[PDB]
Amino acid sequence: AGPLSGLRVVELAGIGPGPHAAMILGDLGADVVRIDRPISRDAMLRNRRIVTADLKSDQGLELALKLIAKADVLIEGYRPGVTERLGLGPEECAKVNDRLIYARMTGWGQTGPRSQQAGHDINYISLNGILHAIGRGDERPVPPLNLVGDFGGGSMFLLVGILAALWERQSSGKGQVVDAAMVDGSSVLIQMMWAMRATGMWTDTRGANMLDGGAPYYDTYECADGRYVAVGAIEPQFYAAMLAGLGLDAAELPPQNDRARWPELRALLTEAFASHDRDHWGAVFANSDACVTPVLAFGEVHNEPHIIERNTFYEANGGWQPMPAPRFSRTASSQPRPPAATIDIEAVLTDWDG
Amino acid sequence: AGPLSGLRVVELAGIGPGPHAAMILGDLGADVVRIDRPISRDAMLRNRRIVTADLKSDQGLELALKLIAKADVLIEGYRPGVTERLGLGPEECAKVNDRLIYARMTGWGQTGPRSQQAGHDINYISLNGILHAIGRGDERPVPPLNLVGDFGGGSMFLLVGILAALWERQSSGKGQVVDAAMVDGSSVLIQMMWAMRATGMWTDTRGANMLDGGAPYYDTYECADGRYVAVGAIEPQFYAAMLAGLGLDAAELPPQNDRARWPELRALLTEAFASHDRDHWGAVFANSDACVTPVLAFGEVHNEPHIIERNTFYEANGGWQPMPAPRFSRTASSQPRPPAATIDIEAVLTDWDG
Ligand SMILES: CCCCCCCCCCCC[C@H](C)C(=O)SCCNC(=O)CCNC(=O)[C@H](O)C(C)(C)COP(=O)(O)OP(=O)(O)OC[C@H]1O[C@@H](n2cnc3c(N)ncnc32)[C@H](O)[C@@H]1OP(=O)(O)O
Ligand SMILES: CCCCCCCCCCCC[C@H](C)C(=O)SCCNC(=O)CCNC(=O)[C@H](O)C(C)(C)COP(=O)(O)OP(=O)(O)OC[C@H]1O[C@@H](n2cnc3c(N)ncnc32)[C@H](O)[C@@H]1OP(=O)(O)O
């Protein structure tokens, strides 16, 4: 039902960014066929058809290629060379389908000294200054889950690459290869900090900047109940609204942007926030522009009115899952279809005509 | 030169996600025209033409609409209702160009109880369980800079919405509205943790999971020089390669996934890593699959061989900036054009035929 209805995607079963990319394509209405090794409880495998094949066997290769001959996009996330050795590399795929967008999802990219090296998110963002910038300044860096390498700088760039290549295809008639490396995507993801560093607006000192926790107006605060609020009152008029809700006199406080006095400012803000519960502040600044919000655990999200009203989540069997994003006014996306039983690869070939 | 060469984008100047989205379109070859209020050192504003109009004025509105009439995409990132009041809302734009992809970039979305409220990244990820999941367990949550709401769950979803809607326009001949809300995108960005929570594979206890710092094999360690390495050795063979490099006898350590003895495991690993400087480990895990990498500060990135050889960065005027991502084999993106002087809006309208 979404805008990608009609798009055919072959996904070679992998882990992390590749399956996430394929999910979003399916989310938006694509026809996604996932080939695995010979009913999943993994909600990420929503919006698929699962088929199986041994790609090291002559029959599996032949069946895979027939599928690929009829697809728009191929997603693979193995080490570079792996698809080549199977006979499913870009040059073999070209011979049967030169309209194909061949999307290669890696951490380190297709070439370079590290291209054959195992790794995970935390490694890809360790090499490009990202990790070093995350966490409190008095302690070692903390990983921002696998949100920045695997997804924000990984699958999301694979998706952009795929969709941009589909635009180009309109006039060239041809596909090509998209090399989406997490080490690259994540760097463009953090381009604002590269831009800020060049102008004296960001330092390499962890935890001492405007957006990393260093600013008392841009951080979390612990409340009376041991729960937290988030404060993001960057603009002076938002900051002023924040001080108001807390019952603090601005004249009695250091100026907002006097970094010399930030520890003094933070102590006053700490004392304020610590005097009531999280839900008290939630109520104080419910409709304000104070940029103060309650910090909800996953298990609490379902109770928040803005989350409910907008149907950001849906109940699948066993728990809430996020609905497709972003939203489309005319070709809206469906509620995702749960994972289903594996189906016969030949049946999909009939459906597609391979 | 990139795959988006030919695409026409009108960007209504704003902050954070919108300008980052426009940048990536520009990066990939789009013809992006930015309308600001009446030459930048913001490297984010690379790959543009900048023009000036007072949109509150009769003549300003008229010129903007003439530009929009010739564009493929419009990006705006103001509060919902703002463009409506200006007379550049979706209903007004449709009258002059129904092929327009109208891309609306917000935190809270177009509708809902919070939709008119101020906020910034830290607020958007505070409402949907993300923030609460970031940081050490013995402390309040830390913001993962503005990487998760503004960009990974923000501009990146706007971009997917834009390019998806363009694909759809191939066959419907028409555009539509993309409502990209950071509270939604970030939720889809963290779908893996929603999937895991449902199967008992992720807990709401901060700092106590596989990918958040709780696992001794997926975290940073401080070295003899006070600098850091990242360890990402999730798979047993990589973990084994890690211990081997450290000269620790496995027989003598707690099992990798015995959570009850994780603190004992961490302490042994801490002692090991602290015995030499970062560059030593740097060297020990050379081309190994041990998933151990050095944690480079921004200012060190330019010295790293894998970074150099792949040209992940380029020297603009004054500092390193990331090259376009992802990479395309046939229609490669150009090195970004630096920000240039504001130009005459009519010269753009002549160029485009408006
Ligand atoms: C409710 C549950 C939710 C689910 C939760 C899941 C669990 C959570 C875990 C989180 C995972 C996310 C983690 C944190 C990340 O950070 S992801 C980043 C990992 N890196 C990458 O993806 C970069 C690209 N990939 C790689 O570098 C490597 O694939 C790897 C991930 C390091 C693993 O290395 P390794 O296991 O040696 O695999 P590869 O070298 O790729 O070779 C794969 C071999 O398998 C074969 N193969 C594949 N498909 C088939 C098939 N259908 N039939 C037959 N064979 C198949 C290939 O031929 C290849 O074999 P060969 O070519 O070596 O002989
Ligand atoms: C090297 C330099 C680097 C540069 C770095 C920049 C500095 C770093 C700062 C950190 C930025 C990143 C932070 C962490 C973020 O999270 S950004 C995300 C902020 N949130 C959003 O974007 C969500 C959607 N937007 C909004 O909610 C709001 O726009 C906002 C950000 C809260 C700002 O609120 P506010 O100032 O009241 O603006 P709005 O309500 O949107 O109204 C805008 C008014 O301006 C007017 N306007 C606009 N363009 C023109 C024009 N060309 N000519 C004449 N007028 C113009 C509009 O008409 C509107 O007026 P009105 O309709 O309100 O009367």
PDB file of C-alpha atoms in Angstrom, chain A residues 22-206:
ATOM      1  CA  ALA A  22      15.102  -4.694   3.652  1.00  0.00           C
ATOM      2  CA  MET A  23      12.465  -4.248   6.437  1.00  0.00           C
ATOM      3  CA  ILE A  24      11.973  -0.581   5.664  1.00  0.00           C
ATOM      4  CA  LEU A  25      11.610  -1.292   1.945  1.00  0.00           C
ATOM      5  CA  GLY A  26       8.950  -3.909   2.783  1.00  0.00           C
ATOM      6  CA  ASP A  27       7.374  -1.476   5.316  1.00  0.00           C
ATOM      7  CA  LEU A  28       6.817   1.038   2.482  1.00  0.00           C
ATOM      8  CA  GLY A  29       5.193  -1.581   0.256  1.00  0.00           C
ATOM      9  CA  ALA A  30       8.057  -3.300  -1.559  1.00  0.00           C
ATOM     10  CA  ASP A  31       7.877  -7.006  -2.529  1.00  0.00           C
ATOM     11  CA  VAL A  32      10.879  -8.346  -0.585  1.00  0.00           C
ATOM     12  CA  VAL A  33      12.124 -11.921  -0.935  1.00  0.00           C
ATOM     13  CA  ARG A  34      14.632 -13.076   1.662  1.00  0.00           C
ATOM     14  CA  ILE A  35      16.881 -16.060   0.808  1.00  0.00           C
ATOM     15  CA  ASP A  36      18.260 -17.934   3.782  1.00  0.00           C
ATOM     16  CA  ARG A  37      20.309 -21.095   4.451  1.00  0.00           C
ATOM     17  CA  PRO A  38      18.303 -24.383   4.511  1.00  0.00           C
ATOM     18  CA  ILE A  39       8.087 -19.099  11.497  1.00  0.00           C
ATOM     19  CA  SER A  40      10.501 -16.483  12.877  1.00  0.00           C
ATOM     20  CA  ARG A  41       9.904 -14.719  16.232  1.00  0.00           C
ATOM     21  CA  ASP A  42      12.027 -11.770  14.948  1.00  0.00           C
ATOM     22  CA  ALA A  43       9.747  -8.773  14.314  1.00  0.00           C
ATOM     23  CA  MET A  44      12.458  -7.261  12.112  1.00  0.00           C
ATOM     24  CA  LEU A  45      11.638  -9.946   9.581  1.00  0.00           C
ATOM     25  CA  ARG A  46       8.228  -8.408   9.039  1.00  0.00           C
ATOM     26  CA  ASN A  47       7.003  -7.717   5.505  1.00  0.00           C
ATOM     27  CA  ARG A  48       8.900 -10.525   3.745  1.00  0.00           C
ATOM     28  CA  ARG A  49       8.591 -13.742   1.914  1.00  0.00           C
ATOM     29  CA  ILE A  50      11.188 -16.186   3.241  1.00  0.00           C
ATOM     30  CA  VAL A  51      12.608 -18.773   0.840  1.00  0.00           C
ATOM     31  CA  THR A  52      15.627 -20.988   1.315  1.00  0.00           C
ATOM     32  CA  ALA A  53      18.533 -22.095  -0.881  1.00  0.00           C
ATOM     33  CA  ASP A  54      22.047 -23.500  -0.602  1.00  0.00           C
ATOM     34  CA  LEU A  55      23.983 -20.904  -2.591  1.00  0.00           C
ATOM     35  CA  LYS A  56      27.076 -23.139  -2.643  1.00  0.00           C
ATOM     36  CA  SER A  57      25.090 -25.750  -4.613  1.00  0.00           C
ATOM     37  CA  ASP A  58      24.618 -25.504  -8.409  1.00  0.00           C
ATOM     38  CA  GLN A  59      20.835 -25.669  -7.987  1.00  0.00           C
ATOM     39  CA  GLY A  60      20.655 -22.952  -5.299  1.00  0.00           C
ATOM     40  CA  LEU A  61      22.832 -20.614  -7.327  1.00  0.00           C
ATOM     41  CA  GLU A  62      20.668 -21.232 -10.374  1.00  0.00           C
ATOM     42  CA  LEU A  63      17.494 -20.549  -8.421  1.00  0.00           C
ATOM     43  CA  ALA A  64      18.971 -17.403  -6.800  1.00  0.00           C
ATOM     44  CA  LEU A  65      20.075 -16.003 -10.187  1.00  0.00           C
ATOM     45  CA  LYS A  66      16.611 -16.615 -11.653  1.00  0.00           C
ATOM     46  CA  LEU A  67      15.090 -14.658  -8.780  1.00  0.00           C
ATOM     47  CA  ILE A  68      17.663 -11.883  -9.210  1.00  0.00           C
ATOM     48  CA  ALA A  69      17.074 -11.708 -12.980  1.00  0.00           C
ATOM     49  CA  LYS A  70      13.548 -10.560 -12.131  1.00  0.00           C
ATOM     50  CA  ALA A  71      14.325  -8.147  -9.222  1.00  0.00           C
ATOM     51  CA  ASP A  72      15.011  -4.388  -8.992  1.00  0.00           C
ATOM     52  CA  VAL A  73      17.280  -4.469  -5.977  1.00  0.00           C
ATOM     53  CA  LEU A  74      19.636  -7.004  -4.392  1.00  0.00           C
ATOM     54  CA  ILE A  75      20.747  -6.544  -0.764  1.00  0.00           C
ATOM     55  CA  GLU A  76      23.825  -8.331   0.453  1.00  0.00           C
ATOM     56  CA  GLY A  77      25.799  -7.827   3.663  1.00  0.00           C
ATOM     57  CA  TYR A  78      28.672 -10.336   3.646  1.00  0.00           C
ATOM     58  CA  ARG A  79      32.427  -9.538   3.513  1.00  0.00           C
ATOM     59  CA  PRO A  80      33.512  -8.221   0.125  1.00  0.00           C
ATOM     60  CA  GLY A  81      34.336 -11.140  -2.266  1.00  0.00           C
ATOM     61  CA  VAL A  82      31.867 -13.534  -0.631  1.00  0.00           C
ATOM     62  CA  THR A  83      29.152 -13.010  -3.262  1.00  0.00           C
ATOM     63  CA  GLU A  84      31.812 -13.143  -5.982  1.00  0.00           C
ATOM     64  CA  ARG A  85      33.000 -16.585  -4.802  1.00  0.00           C
ATOM     65  CA  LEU A  86      29.403 -17.832  -4.925  1.00  0.00           C
ATOM     66  CA  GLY A  87      28.813 -16.659  -8.510  1.00  0.00           C
ATOM     67  CA  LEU A  88      26.381 -13.968  -7.334  1.00  0.00           C
ATOM     68  CA  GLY A  89      28.769 -10.999  -7.562  1.00  0.00           C
ATOM     69  CA  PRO A  90      27.794  -7.795  -9.458  1.00  0.00           C
ATOM     70  CA  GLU A  91      29.416  -8.965 -12.736  1.00  0.00           C
ATOM     71  CA  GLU A  92      27.484 -12.263 -12.750  1.00  0.00           C
ATOM     72  CA  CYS A  93      24.257 -10.477 -11.852  1.00  0.00           C
ATOM     73  CA  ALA A  94      24.879  -8.000 -14.656  1.00  0.00           C
ATOM     74  CA  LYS A  95      24.782 -10.810 -17.252  1.00  0.00           C
ATOM     75  CA  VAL A  96      21.215 -11.724 -16.311  1.00  0.00           C
ATOM     76  CA  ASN A  97      19.896  -8.299 -15.201  1.00  0.00           C
ATOM     77  CA  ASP A  98      21.635  -4.987 -15.897  1.00  0.00           C
ATOM     78  CA  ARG A  99      18.680  -3.050 -14.443  1.00  0.00           C
ATOM     79  CA  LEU A 100      19.640  -4.331 -10.998  1.00  0.00           C
ATOM     80  CA  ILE A 101      20.579  -2.076  -8.103  1.00  0.00           C
ATOM     81  CA  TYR A 102      23.218  -4.167  -6.335  1.00  0.00           C
ATOM     82  CA  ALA A 103      23.363  -2.923  -2.758  1.00  0.00           C
ATOM     83  CA  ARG A 104      26.382  -3.957  -0.741  1.00  0.00           C
ATOM     84  CA  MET A 105      26.134  -3.296   2.980  1.00  0.00           C
ATOM     85  CA  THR A 106      29.454  -3.373   4.907  1.00  0.00           C
ATOM     86  CA  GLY A 107      31.167  -1.695   7.880  1.00  0.00           C
ATOM     87  CA  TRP A 108      34.538  -0.976   6.250  1.00  0.00           C
ATOM     88  CA  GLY A 109      33.572  -0.843   2.552  1.00  0.00           C
ATOM     89  CA  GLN A 110      34.459  -2.825  -0.574  1.00  0.00           C
ATOM     90  CA  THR A 111      38.212  -2.004  -0.586  1.00  0.00           C
ATOM     91  CA  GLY A 112      40.958  -0.673   1.733  1.00  0.00           C
ATOM     92  CA  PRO A 113      43.294  -2.159   4.407  1.00  0.00           C
ATOM     93  CA  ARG A 114      40.408  -3.137   6.716  1.00  0.00           C
ATOM     94  CA  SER A 115      37.931  -4.358   4.070  1.00  0.00           C
ATOM     95  CA  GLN A 116      38.475  -8.066   4.972  1.00  0.00           C
ATOM     96  CA  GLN A 117      38.416  -7.468   8.751  1.00  0.00           C
ATOM     97  CA  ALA A 118      35.484  -8.660  10.959  1.00  0.00           C
ATOM     98  CA  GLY A 119      33.829  -5.992  13.011  1.00  0.00           C
ATOM     99  CA  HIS A 120      30.644  -4.647  14.522  1.00  0.00           C
ATOM    100  CA  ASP A 121      29.099  -1.162  15.001  1.00  0.00           C
ATOM    101  CA  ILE A 122      31.280  -0.095  17.900  1.00  0.00           C
ATOM    102  CA  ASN A 123      34.379  -0.719  15.713  1.00  0.00           C
ATOM    103  CA  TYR A 124      33.140   1.260  12.642  1.00  0.00           C
ATOM    104  CA  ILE A 125      32.344   4.315  14.825  1.00  0.00           C
ATOM    105  CA  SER A 126      35.566   3.941  16.848  1.00  0.00           C
ATOM    106  CA  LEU A 127      37.692   4.759  13.731  1.00  0.00           C
ATOM    107  CA  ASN A 128      35.940   7.939  12.634  1.00  0.00           C
ATOM    108  CA  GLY A 129      35.832  10.029  15.877  1.00  0.00           C
ATOM    109  CA  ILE A 130      32.127   9.233  16.632  1.00  0.00           C
ATOM    110  CA  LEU A 131      32.534   6.902  19.628  1.00  0.00           C
ATOM    111  CA  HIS A 132      35.156   9.024  21.260  1.00  0.00           C
ATOM    112  CA  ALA A 133      32.535  11.913  21.365  1.00  0.00           C
ATOM    113  CA  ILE A 134      29.840   9.842  23.194  1.00  0.00           C
ATOM    114  CA  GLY A 135      29.494   9.744  26.994  1.00  0.00           C
ATOM    115  CA  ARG A 136      30.414  11.612  30.148  1.00  0.00           C
ATOM    116  CA  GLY A 137      33.791  13.356  30.076  1.00  0.00           C
ATOM    117  CA  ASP A 138      35.136  11.784  33.234  1.00  0.00           C
ATOM    118  CA  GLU A 139      34.820   8.218  31.905  1.00  0.00           C
ATOM    119  CA  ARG A 140      35.482   5.935  28.984  1.00  0.00           C
ATOM    120  CA  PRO A 141      33.295   6.299  25.848  1.00  0.00           C
ATOM    121  CA  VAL A 142      29.926   4.589  25.919  1.00  0.00           C
ATOM    122  CA  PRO A 143      28.400   2.955  22.852  1.00  0.00           C
ATOM    123  CA  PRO A 144      25.111   4.636  21.634  1.00  0.00           C
ATOM    124  CA  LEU A 145      23.758   1.107  21.247  1.00  0.00           C
ATOM    125  CA  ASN A 146      24.218   0.090  17.529  1.00  0.00           C
ATOM    126  CA  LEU A 147      22.165   3.020  16.486  1.00  0.00           C
ATOM    127  CA  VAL A 148      24.878   5.106  14.734  1.00  0.00           C
ATOM    128  CA  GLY A 149      26.909   2.534  12.737  1.00  0.00           C
ATOM    129  CA  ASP A 150      24.394  -0.232  11.967  1.00  0.00           C
ATOM    130  CA  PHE A 151      21.343   1.912  11.387  1.00  0.00           C
ATOM    131  CA  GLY A 152      21.646   5.762  11.230  1.00  0.00           C
ATOM    132  CA  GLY A 153      24.940   5.529   9.258  1.00  0.00           C
ATOM    133  CA  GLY A 154      24.356   2.008   7.805  1.00  0.00           C
ATOM    134  CA  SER A 155      20.996   0.741   6.674  1.00  0.00           C
ATOM    135  CA  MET A 156      19.712   4.286   6.200  1.00  0.00           C
ATOM    136  CA  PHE A 157      22.511   5.087   3.766  1.00  0.00           C
ATOM    137  CA  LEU A 158      21.981   1.764   1.981  1.00  0.00           C
ATOM    138  CA  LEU A 159      18.331   2.844   1.587  1.00  0.00           C
ATOM    139  CA  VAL A 160      19.206   6.296   0.247  1.00  0.00           C
ATOM    140  CA  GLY A 161      21.702   4.623  -2.122  1.00  0.00           C
ATOM    141  CA  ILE A 162      19.124   2.109  -3.381  1.00  0.00           C
ATOM    142  CA  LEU A 163      16.421   4.720  -3.893  1.00  0.00           C
ATOM    143  CA  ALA A 164      18.761   7.287  -5.478  1.00  0.00           C
ATOM    144  CA  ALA A 165      19.998   4.605  -7.869  1.00  0.00           C
ATOM    145  CA  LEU A 166      16.381   3.856  -8.781  1.00  0.00           C
ATOM    146  CA  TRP A 167      15.956   7.546  -9.716  1.00  0.00           C
ATOM    147  CA  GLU A 168      19.050   7.483 -11.908  1.00  0.00           C
ATOM    148  CA  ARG A 169      17.795   4.264 -13.585  1.00  0.00           C
ATOM    149  CA  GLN A 170      14.770   6.192 -14.915  1.00  0.00           C
ATOM    150  CA  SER A 171      17.005   7.920 -17.473  1.00  0.00           C
ATOM    151  CA  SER A 172      20.031   5.657 -17.879  1.00  0.00           C
ATOM    152  CA  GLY A 173      17.824   2.528 -18.091  1.00  0.00           C
ATOM    153  CA  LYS A 174      20.509   0.807 -16.029  1.00  0.00           C
ATOM    154  CA  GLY A 175      21.326  -0.159 -12.464  1.00  0.00           C
ATOM    155  CA  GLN A 176      24.742  -0.114 -10.798  1.00  0.00           C
ATOM    156  CA  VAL A 177      26.489  -0.995  -7.519  1.00  0.00           C
ATOM    157  CA  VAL A 178      25.894   0.856  -4.232  1.00  0.00           C
ATOM    158  CA  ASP A 179      28.811   0.474  -1.811  1.00  0.00           C
ATOM    159  CA  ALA A 180      27.383   1.520   1.580  1.00  0.00           C
ATOM    160  CA  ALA A 181      30.032   1.404   4.240  1.00  0.00           C
ATOM    161  CA  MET A 182      29.086   2.183   7.853  1.00  0.00           C
ATOM    162  CA  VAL A 183      32.355   3.995   8.319  1.00  0.00           C
ATOM    163  CA  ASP A 184      31.280   6.445   5.533  1.00  0.00           C
ATOM    164  CA  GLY A 185      27.533   6.705   6.298  1.00  0.00           C
ATOM    165  CA  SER A 186      28.140   7.406   9.979  1.00  0.00           C
ATOM    166  CA  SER A 187      30.639  10.197   9.069  1.00  0.00           C
ATOM    167  CA  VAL A 188      28.122  11.927   6.823  1.00  0.00           C
ATOM    168  CA  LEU A 189      25.621  11.289   9.657  1.00  0.00           C
ATOM    169  CA  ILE A 190      27.821  13.340  12.016  1.00  0.00           C
ATOM    170  CA  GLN A 191      28.676  16.078   9.327  1.00  0.00           C
ATOM    171  CA  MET A 192      27.256  18.746  11.641  1.00  0.00           C
ATOM    172  CA  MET A 193      30.072  18.092  14.176  1.00  0.00           C
ATOM    173  CA  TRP A 194      32.729  18.162  11.370  1.00  0.00           C
ATOM    174  CA  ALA A 195      31.241  21.505  10.264  1.00  0.00           C
ATOM    175  CA  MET A 196      31.160  22.812  13.848  1.00  0.00           C
ATOM    176  CA  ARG A 197      34.758  21.697  14.570  1.00  0.00           C
ATOM    177  CA  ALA A 198      35.972  23.806  11.579  1.00  0.00           C
ATOM    178  CA  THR A 199      34.379  26.933  13.157  1.00  0.00           C
ATOM    179  CA  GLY A 200      35.364  26.627  16.887  1.00  0.00           C
ATOM    180  CA  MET A 201      31.846  25.407  17.757  1.00  0.00           C
ATOM    181  CA  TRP A 202      32.782  21.817  18.770  1.00  0.00           C
ATOM    182  CA  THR A 203      35.782  20.375  20.635  1.00  0.00           C
ATOM    183  CA  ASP A 204      37.259  16.886  20.820  1.00  0.00           C
ATOM    184  CA  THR A 205      36.781  16.944  24.631  1.00  0.00           C
ATOM    185  CA  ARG A 206      34.136  14.336  25.450  1.00  0.00           C
TER     186      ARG A 206
END
